[PDB]
Amino acid sequence: VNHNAQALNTLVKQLSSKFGAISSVLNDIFSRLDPPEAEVQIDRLITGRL
Amino acid sequence: QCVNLITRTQSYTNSFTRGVYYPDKVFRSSVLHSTQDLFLPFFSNVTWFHAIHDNPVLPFNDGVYFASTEKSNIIRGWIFGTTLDSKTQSLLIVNNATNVVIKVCEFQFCNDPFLDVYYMESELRVYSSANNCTFEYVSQPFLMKNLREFVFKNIDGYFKIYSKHTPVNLGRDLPQGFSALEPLVDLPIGINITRFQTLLALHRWTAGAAAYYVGYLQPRTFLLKYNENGTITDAVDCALDPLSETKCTLK
Amino acid sequence: SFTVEKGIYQTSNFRVQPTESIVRFPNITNLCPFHEVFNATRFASVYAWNRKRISNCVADYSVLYNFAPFFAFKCYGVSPTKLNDLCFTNVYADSFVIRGNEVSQIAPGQTGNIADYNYKLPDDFTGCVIAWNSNKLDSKVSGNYNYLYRLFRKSKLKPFERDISTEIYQAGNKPCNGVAGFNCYFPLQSYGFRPTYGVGHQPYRVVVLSFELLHAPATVCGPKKSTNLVKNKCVNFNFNGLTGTGVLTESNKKFLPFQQFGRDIADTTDAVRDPQTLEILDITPCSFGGVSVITPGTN
Amino acid sequence: GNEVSQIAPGQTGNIADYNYKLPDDFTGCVIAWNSNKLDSKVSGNYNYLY
Amino acid sequence: NRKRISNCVADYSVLYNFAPFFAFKCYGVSPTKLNDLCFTNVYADSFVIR
Ligand SMILES: *[C@@H]1O[C@H](CO)[C@@H](O)[C@H](O)[C@H]1NC(C)=O
Numbered sequence: 001v002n003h004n005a006q007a008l009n010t011l012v013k014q015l016s017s018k019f020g021a022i023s024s025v026l027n028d029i030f031s032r033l034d035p036p037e038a039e040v041q042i043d044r045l046i047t048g049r050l
Numbered sequence: 051q052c053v054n055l056i057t058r059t060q061s062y063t064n065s066f067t068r069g070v071y072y073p074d075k076v077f078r079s080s081v082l083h084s085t086q087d088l089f090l091p092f093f094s095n096v097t098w099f100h101a102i103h104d105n106p107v108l109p110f111n112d113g114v115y116f117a118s119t120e121k122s123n124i125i126r127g128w129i130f131g132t133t134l135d136s137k138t139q140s141l142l143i144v145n146n147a148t149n150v151v152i153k154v155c156e157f158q159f160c161n162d163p164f165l166d167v168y169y170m171e172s173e174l175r176v177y178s179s180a181n182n183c184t185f186e187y188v189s190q191p192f193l194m195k196n197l198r199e200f201v202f203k204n205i206d207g208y209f210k211i212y213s214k215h216t217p218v219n220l221g222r223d224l225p226q227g228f229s230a231l232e233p234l235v236d237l238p239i240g241i242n243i244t245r246f247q248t249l250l251a252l253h254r255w256t257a258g259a260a261a262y263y264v265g266y267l268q269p270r271t272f273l274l275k276y277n278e279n280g281t282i283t284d285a286v287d288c289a290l291d292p293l294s295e296t297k298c299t300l301k
Numbered sequence: 302s303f304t305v306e307k308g309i310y311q312t313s314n315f316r317v318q319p320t321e322s323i324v325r326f327p328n329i330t331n332l333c334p335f336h337e338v339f340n341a342t343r344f345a346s347v348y349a350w351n352r353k354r355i356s357n358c359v360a361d362y363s364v365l366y367n368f369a370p371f372f373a374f375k376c377y378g379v380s381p382t383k384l385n386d387l388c389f390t391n392v393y394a395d396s397f398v399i400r401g402n403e404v405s406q407i408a409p410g411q412t413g414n415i416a417d418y419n420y421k422l423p424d425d426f427t428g429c430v431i432a433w434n435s436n437k438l439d440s441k442v443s444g445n446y447n448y449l450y451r452l453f454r455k456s457k458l459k460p461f462e463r464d465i466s467t468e469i470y471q472a473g474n475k476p477c478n479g480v481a482g483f484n485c486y487f488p489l490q491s492y493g494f495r496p497t498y499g500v501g502h503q504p505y506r507v508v509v510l511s512f513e514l515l516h517a518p519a520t521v522c523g524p525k526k527s528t529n530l531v532k533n534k535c536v537n538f539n540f541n542g543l544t545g546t547g548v549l550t551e552s553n554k555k556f557l558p559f560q561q562f563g564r565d566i567a568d569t570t571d572a573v574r575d576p577q578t579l580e581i582l583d584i585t586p587c588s589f590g591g592v593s594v595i596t597p598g599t600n
Numbered sequence: 601g602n603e604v605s606q607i608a609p610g611q612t613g614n615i616a617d618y619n620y621k622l623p624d625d626f627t628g629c630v631i632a633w634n635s636n637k638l639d640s641k642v643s644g645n646y647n648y649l650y
Numbered sequence: 651n652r653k654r655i656s657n658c659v660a661d662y663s664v665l666y667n668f669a670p671f672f673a674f675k676c677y678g679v680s681p682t683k684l685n686d687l688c689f690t691n692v693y694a695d696s697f698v699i700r
Pocket residue numbers: 062093094095096
């Protein structure tokens with residue numbers, strides 16, 4: 001039981017990382033940056049979550 | 051003008067887990083958060099001063115923890131600076147019955163600054179010149195058995211102040227427990243602070259006394275804890291002992 | 302495939318679409334005084350640059366283009382075209398005059414004369430700099446001496462800190478006790494702009510804007526009309542510049558007066574406080590779930 | 601002159617919203633050069649609308 | 651031309667006092683960090699173009 005509980009908790013907790021970007025919230029990046037830099041910041045988050 | 055009528059004595063005391071403040075203005079509940087910042091190390095030694103109606107200037111090493119329990123309203127305000135001379139800039143946090151005043155000018159401080167009041171508070175006993183400055187500030191009074199705690203630090207040209215009130219039964223030294231401090235103001239001063247002092251008020255002089263504690267902050271890592279209502283009720287110092295290090299590692 | 306075998310299969314899941322949109326901004330009516338900043342008769346020196354605090358006003362950032370002959374901003378952490386739609390706590394405006402070749406040092410990480418002895422920027426600067434040439438006015442004739450700058454100093458500065466002392470600097474192990482030469486120099490040396498210098502040597506004008514993010518209640522941001530509050534319905538919202546989609550509900554969380562946001566384990570916003578009516582609300586996504594299809598073989 | 605930066609994908613404002621909109625997936629070259637002697641006229645050149 | 655420079659102390663900060671150039675365009679290093687590195691030899695070229 002504990003293995004599954006801990007694995008799911010770790011997966012949920014991992015969503016708060018930046019992976020080298022400026023924020024961990026996609027909406028803030030979208031609102032504060034133009035697409036040329038928004039893609040560069042967002043691909044890092046996408047790759048990390050993958 | 052400048053007179054010398056104050057002598058001070060020093061005693062030593064232990065802290066017992068005091069000096070925890072809220073690291074950010076965000077509500078959290080039922081979580082264990084880890085923060086790395088400047089805090090007061092647990093179980094540290096703090097000098098206990100007695101001012102009796104000469105006194106030198108204390109250093110300012112990466113922040114200062116200031117606590118006192120005098121209910122006679124004799125302590126009011128502090129001086130911050132690097133040389134406390136008319137050749138540099140220095141802060142003059144001063145408090146009175148209705149408002150606080152915060153100024154940073156090229157003050158020419160006296161050796162033993164204080165305030166004298168008669169029958170209408172005066173100010174001439176502190177400095178002589180107040181030119182070359184732009185930054186003034188007023189707000190509500192900071193100061194209202196009762197223990198009052200303050201934390202100051204200077205980072206990125208910003209001066210931050212925290213405070214808290216705690217009704218506590220009389221004791222020989224600081225109490226045991228947890229009471230988190232909440233922020234007051236984050237001023238954009240942007241000056242050099244190396245040494246600091248404290249201000250006293252006398253009646254005309256008539257006898258008086260004051261007692262206050264001083265402690266210095268250090269870069270540490272703490273593991274806070276929030277209850278179900280959003281209040282900090284416990285903490286762990288990561289660099290105190292191996293058991294605390296294990297607790298920090300295991301979260 | 303064009304043929305499906307017997308079994309149960311999982312297809313795309315269903316989501317509930319939002320109905321309308323919600324915008325909620327504070328009660329601000331007056332306008333920010335950028336004209337008295339940009340259109341100023343006198344400009345301070347680099348060692349005694351001036352900081353002006355701006356608060357409690359509506360900021361129209363497209364107006365600045367009609368104020369001075371500059372080309373474009375160079376913005377770090379934000380983009381020039383989205384200065385609107387964002388609400389900040391405070392806005393500052395540091396202004397001075399420097400030389401053309403030295404404009405490139407107004408940026409994080411730069412070192413040299415400035416960024417070590419005159420004006421230092423932090424490593425996490427959020428904001429940007431407006432620079433343009435000012436040969437026509439600051440270089441009237443036979444140079445100028447109103448603009449000073451520190452030449453050398455015993456140690457580097459720190460972000461946004463200021464030094465104003467005018468002392469005598471020693472170069473030899475003897476005390477100067479006044480200016481005497483060969484050890485003693487007056488650190489405030491002045492350049493003079495003759496109206497004949499090269500392009501890189503002509504004077505320039507600099508205005509730096511620094512933003513801090515939302516931790517205190519918002520005071521400065523651009524124009525945006527605000528609608529009413531709609532609750533118990535999936536809807537996309539906008540609270541002081543943060544977007545999302547969910548359901549707004551009455552809350553009972555005990556926010557302290559200095560707090561205005563809530564966070565979850567994943568550090569995602571959970572609760573929020575309405576800027577106009579200081580009440581507490583909850584945010585929950587509207588319903589979704591998987592869908593499966595049960596079929597025998599197409600044969 | 602200070603409006604050249606608006607001729608690019610993702611730009612917003614006056615020109616890029618009311619006069620000339622470029623696609624976000626634009627491909628090609630954009631070239632702009634100053635033209636003052638043959639464009640500016642004393643008492644103001646008025647036959648240029650936006 | 652091509653001049654070989656060796657066995658000397660290079661001060662790259664004084665270059666700004668010899669010609670009115672705005673800044674550098676550097677590929678493997680940065681202009682601000684040229685004061686720390688130590689090189690084997692340095693080659694300087696010069697010509698005039700349009
Ligand atoms: C604090 O200083 C006193 C000096 O009187 C010393 O006895 C005590 O052990 C010190 N506390 C420490 C080092 O934690």
